[PDB]
Amino acid sequence: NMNVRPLLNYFEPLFTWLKDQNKNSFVGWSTDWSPYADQSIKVRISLK
């Protein structure tokens, strides 16, 4: 089967460097922000 461990072993020094460099950061993202949310307008319609 295909193994991903070789890639992790190859990039381990870079992973350690990033972890050292990412202490004052927020790993991850939120699926709600958008470049147009700050200037958008919400509408709500109730026909019945």
Binding site: R44, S46, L47, K48
Partner: protein, 51 residues
């Protein structure tokens, strides 16, 4: 007795109206919160939809 009849009829009407408004406010709040289709959430099925 006749006066009591006349008064309590209107009193019951007012109580029924207040109860209907109580139901309507909760229904509207739930519909706005969960974005359910309008008119779909009725008074009869309130408990089932709540659960």
């Amino acid at each position: 007795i006749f006066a009591s009849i006349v008064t309590f009829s209107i009193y019951g009407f007012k109580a029924t109206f207040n109860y209907e408004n109580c139901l309507k406010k909760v229904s509207l709040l739930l519909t706005n919160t969960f974005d359910l289709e309008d008119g779909f959430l009725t008074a009869s099925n309130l408990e089932q939809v709540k659960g």
